[PDB]
Design a protein around this ligand. Structure first.
Ligand SMILES: Cc1cc2nc3c(=O)[nH]c(=O)nc-3n(C[C@H](O)[C@H](O)[C@H](O)COP(=O)(O)OP(=O)(O)OC[C@H]3O[C@@H](n4cnc5c(N)ncnc54)[C@H](O)[C@@H]3O)c2cc1C
Length: 284
């Protein structure tokens, strides 16, 4: 009766699971909410010039899927003296959607059965059953499935900041280095999100490194000097992105019959989740 089990309910598991559910499948999710997941700090802003490598071949079917399922909003961002249109999917809408039921437990094993796949859970005598399994477990995907591509999965950490009870009159993109932009916008009607775009080897991460990105972000919105961290006015959101070098969109591979690995979204984020989901609707 269960068609697909999706392991992981970050952006990639959430989007894939709901696209399959919308396509008529019986989908079940499993997620253990482990700390440092990649999707908590995400803004889900998609500027078309950021995704040139992808190609209209993939950008457009992906954006259409996200618009059909969640709705895509067009935001006119300030870019110096000029303006630029950026597409937005509300991350709270993607990550909080409840169509797909999610077991808030830890997957410990995957086993082929005669009818499909059995998904073991920590501390559970029975396994969850499905014809197919999509493992969208972020940087932890290689803990459950292995492949030459997954042998290259590493984490690229980063931080973004959310200021409470605040709105920007001007949502902006401002560069601080080639291909490094400080982005500030109204992520909710009450909150301002700012990120500087840096990615870090999770080893080279510490409070000093975080304060460097905080200084960038707070100067871009004129909050430097106000001690907003110590005062509780801003939340730091740390996450580890799943990076695999050389990935086309992201990694979507059928490692065994019915067993898919969906990860490697550090490079392109939400738009490549949309591409992968459209692929899975076609192929499952
Ligand atoms: C600072 C920062 C800024 C970002 N900004 C953006 C942005 O503007 N736009 C954008 O699109 N993206 C953004 N991202 C996100 C980026 O695209 C990530 O690559 C993306 O979130 C990856 O999502 P994922 O679903 O593959 O992984 P994750 O979000 O890490 O999800 C993996 C999930 O799998 C679960 N899991 C793992 N193993 C198991 C197990 N054994 N059993 C059960 N559950 C398990 C984990 O608990 C977790 O919830 C940002 C990330 C960071 C850190």
């Amino acid at each position: 009766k269960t068609d697909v089990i999706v392991v992981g309910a970050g952006l990639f598991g959430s989007i894939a699971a709901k696209a399959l559910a919308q396509a008529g499948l019986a989908v079940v999710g499993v997620d253990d909410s482990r700390p440092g997941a990649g999707s908590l700090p995400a803004a889900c802003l998609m500027k078309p010039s950021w995704f040139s490598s992808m190609g209209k071949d993939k950008f457009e079917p992906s954006l259409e899927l996200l618009d059909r399922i969640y709705g895509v909003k067009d935001i006119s961002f300030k870019v110096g003296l000029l303006r630029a249109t950026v597409h937005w999917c509300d991350p709270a809408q993607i990550l909080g959607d409840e169509e797909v039921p999610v077991y808030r437990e830890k997957v410990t094993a995957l086993t082929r059965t005669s009818s499909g796949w059995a998904v073991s859970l920590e501390g559970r005598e029975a396994a969850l059953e499905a014809r197919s399994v999509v493992v969208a477990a972020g940087v932890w995907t290689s803990e459950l499935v292995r492949s030459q591509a997954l042998g290259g999965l590493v984490g690229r950490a980063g931080v973004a900041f959310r200021w409470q009870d605040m709105q920007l009159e001007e949502q902006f993109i401002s560069p601080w280095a080639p291909y490094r932009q400080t982005v500030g916008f109204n992520i909710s009607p009450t909150e301002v999100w700012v990120g500087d775009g840096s990615a870090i080897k999770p080893e080279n991460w510490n409070q000093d490194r975080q304060n460097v990105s905080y200084s960038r972000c707070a100067q871009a919105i004129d909050r430097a000097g106000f001690g907003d961290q110590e005062a509780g006015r801003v939340k730091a959101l740390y996450g580890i992105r799943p990076y695999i070098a050389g990935v086309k969109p992201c990694l979507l591979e059928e490692v065994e019959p019915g067993l898919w690995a969906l990860t490697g979204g550090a490079k392109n984020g939400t738009i490549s989740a949309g591409w992968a989901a459209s692929e899975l609707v076609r192929r499952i």
